[PDB]
Amino acid sequence: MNMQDAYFGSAAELDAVNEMLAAIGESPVTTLDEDGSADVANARRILNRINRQIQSKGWAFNINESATLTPDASTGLIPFRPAYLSILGGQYINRGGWVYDKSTGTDTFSGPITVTLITLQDYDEMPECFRQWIVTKASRQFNSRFFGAEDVENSLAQEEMEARMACNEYEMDFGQYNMLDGDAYVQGLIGR
Amino acid sequence: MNMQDAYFGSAAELDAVNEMLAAIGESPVTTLDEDGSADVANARRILNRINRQIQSKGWAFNINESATLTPDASTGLIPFRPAYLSILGGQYINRGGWVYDKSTGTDTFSGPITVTLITLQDYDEMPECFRQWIVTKASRQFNSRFFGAEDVENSLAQEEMEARMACNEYEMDFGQYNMLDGDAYVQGLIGR
Amino acid sequence: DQDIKTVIQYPVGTTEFDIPFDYLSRKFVRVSLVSDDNRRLLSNITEYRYVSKTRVKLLVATTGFDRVEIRRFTSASERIVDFSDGSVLRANDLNVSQLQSAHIAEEARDAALLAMPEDDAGNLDARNRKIVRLAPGEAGTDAINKNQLDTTL
Amino acid sequence: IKTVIQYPVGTTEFDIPFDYLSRKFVRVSLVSDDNRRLLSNITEYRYVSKTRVKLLVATTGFDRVEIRRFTSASERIVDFSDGSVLRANDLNVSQLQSAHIAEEARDAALLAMPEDDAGNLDARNRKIVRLAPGEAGTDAINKNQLDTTLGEAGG
Amino acid sequence: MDQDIKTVIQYPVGTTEFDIPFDYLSRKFVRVSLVSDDNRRLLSNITEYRYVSKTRVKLLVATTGFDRVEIRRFTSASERIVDFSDGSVLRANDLNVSQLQSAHIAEEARDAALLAMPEDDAGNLDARNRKIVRLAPGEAGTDAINKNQLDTTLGE
Amino acid sequence: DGVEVMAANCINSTMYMLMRNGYNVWIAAVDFKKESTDFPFEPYRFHVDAKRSYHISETAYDIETNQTVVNVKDIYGASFAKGTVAICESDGKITEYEPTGNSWDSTPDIRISGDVSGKNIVIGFLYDFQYVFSRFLIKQEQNDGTTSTEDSGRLQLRRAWVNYQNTGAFTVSVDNGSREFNYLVNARVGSTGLRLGQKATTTGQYRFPVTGNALYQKVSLSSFNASPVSIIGCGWEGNYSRRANGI
């Protein structure tokens, strides 16, 4: 079997959990049982939380500024799904499990409303730089909660910082923000 | 991959693993396929992860600003293969395993689209300076995860910093960037 | 055959439905809202949730759609079981490894059986259905549409 | 098509051309253009050898005897267990079950109209029975429409 | 491509380098063909095209006379890449590749099954803008007719 | 399950003893053989209870049902109530053959599968080797010769390990008040000991995750296999975080 003739890829979710366990020196796991092994149950729970937490920060690729929400058909209630990491562009507060206008004291909407929305995404559906930050941050947390070594925590603290910088540069490279022509107020002043 | 001789693609990768083993004071191995163990296997996993981590940062040689993606013939879907470390220069976000457009809410493309792409490239076909950095960084990460010594990590931290500088100088020598005649905006101002 | 287990369609009007097949991963299961003219794939996370291992609940409205479809689509790119040197060999991993390939192959067989089959007479049976689209036939023995017929007329 | 074979009636002994992992995967049925019925093991037929079977019941009213392979994906022929010695043959048979199901899927596609070579859909010199009249021009047209429209033009 | 088909892709002509959009276990399983409406011809490795990288190929032959470039996966069912023998050490790579070969064959069967004419959502057979080649003459009143009969009845 | 032991007397290593079953009475012996097997053909000891070697007759195969019928009563001379009968071939293959229904006295036949004919199988009942650890607490050696623990502050133990000499693919089970996790110890993939033809010797040490309060984590072992097991020692590690120092 010549590996150079073959190109194949494994599961991204399994590798992330598998890479998290290697951070404390443990052996790899073949499958994501979630019932037989406590490491898989503990690791995936931490990985899901870190993945959800990082996305909720708001980046140029997961922020949708033209998202619309249809207000059902019979009643104006819009379901405030728990998947919505943040709703911006207006004042909406999830008053009772439904979207609340919070500017006009109403819970029922006649027509679709445009909002800035961040919806939860699968872990494998992220840029590679963001995936590395998610795994490194989760493994660093997974050490402190469960293993709690000293030299491992110090090493992972530097690794998480380095991965956060790589995501920051990708944020600027993706957005290409400008303080003269991309700025919302200076651009008007440039006109002559 | 080495199309000239498939040996070079496996001999080089053998030395990389055979060099991270020596980082913790281990006798060299001869055949990678016939020596499974739990230490060589861990070494290759870290080397693979470190390889794409450094590549995904973006360098003057692995960035293709004129890369095109052909969107099928009948349909218009571009598969988002995992080899695409970072697709920037536009608004493509990997919506559902395919290439999205964000700016235009569409998934199907009529014709090929140009975009700045970073493709995952094999370890053996990297610049020698980057090959040294990948191995040195991987061996340092391979120490802390499994061996976790103290004086070994102190020495490896210096080597990784020293190796990173060599890549930074080569990145500058490769691109020979200019703030007068290579600059995208001063060039117009210099015109007289 | 009518023993197809991977594909099932329920009429709309109920919030909860049962998955009639077993699956290895939740992302191998596809839930869609199907109508005669429109069809859209309900995402996970937002659109629906799993009441239990074998039952789902729709969190969206089904207005404009006639049927709810649940279909198994296993992917071979995403391996459920990955073997690594130095890791404990378990018979469960070997069983699941074989199961994934069988699941994909069974999906292939169900898809083929869902097509139009030939009856026992040895010729294709359309079962009183009408063939649509069907780009015009250029060879002599090719099937024809009325656009070929109308020009002939 | 390897997984499906049909034999004319008149003989009690029939061969099985395809290799099968289990005797339960093999399906023996009596096929006629009008009706079709399945045969249960032991009671309706018995296995003369590994590759041959004999029909105990009569074949009256049925033109052909059909033998088909239907590998069950739910049940695994090779059950891997700990404390039992693993064999290379056990691994080989384990992959063979998935390969057999794929072969049946390819054959089942061949019974219908699959794509041949450069796209298109081929009926291997097989006519299409039943079918419905086409509402639109793109839709296929049955022989009744041809007979009426060109029969009136013809006469 | 699309959601249902993975092993098949067709690119319009206009460039020399093309991408392989699927994972494969051997380079012999990747088949590159030049496709047009009238005809379609297969390309051999080395002589006609060479592997740029593990997922990209460059074709050396001229692409004139053809409309599209198709890359398709053909996993050999008869020939197993990994053969297990007694007395040999069991490795994870062998288990991974042996599992994948069965899986890759299963996908190829799935794509072939889905390429056959399916029933659509409306409830009737859907040819998907593909002409039905071959086909036998229809005798009964409710039968699909070929163009031979259409031309035959035109004579009178 | 309902086997009563009477008159267990041992000469040298061998330990002879008589048993009642509810159907029959028999004499059995327990021998502490080291690096040896009861029968020449078997590869290893085949740690299966009530074991004996049987040579299946050539005629005991049916083309119709494609099964090799073996009678438990005809080979043992007795009848058994309950248990998992394991039939071991020469190559080391082992298959468990739980009775069809309502004990073995009612249904004493075993179907097997493919043609076997004369192969000198080894047939017996599987028995469960179970051992549960004591609570993983901090133990002080003291000076008067007895070991004393400290229980002033809680201890969150994080990982544990087990040392084994050879073993035969046993399993480790961690149970607390709420859930129960199972970890299986066996030969590692890509190991010289693990070969396709031969049995797995699997020497080494295995580490498994055990998380929670020390007083509630229960660690146990179980084999239920025909393969021998051999556990040497164990260990644990966790976060103590004592509140007040002991004078």
Add this chain to the structure above:
Amino acid sequence: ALVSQSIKNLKGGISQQPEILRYPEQGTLQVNGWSSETEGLQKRPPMVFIKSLGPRGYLGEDPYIHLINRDEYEQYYAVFTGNDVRVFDLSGYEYQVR
């Protein structure tokens, strides 16, 4: 911090004592286990089955059994039932007694 302890050998046994008081070596349950001197814990050797002596109650409900060990060739296994005496050898053969 991370504190660890190791139990070198599991010679141990079983303890009915409270978990705080019992030694690390002693366990709570041990069934079908042979705690050897060299290997810490082992599965007990298999029980080999030789000969069947008859139906239940053949030896009486509550017999008195004595083992006779005279020579390497002859070993007699005498059983005193409620109202009868029976003699067996270690090979399972039964000797008539008058």
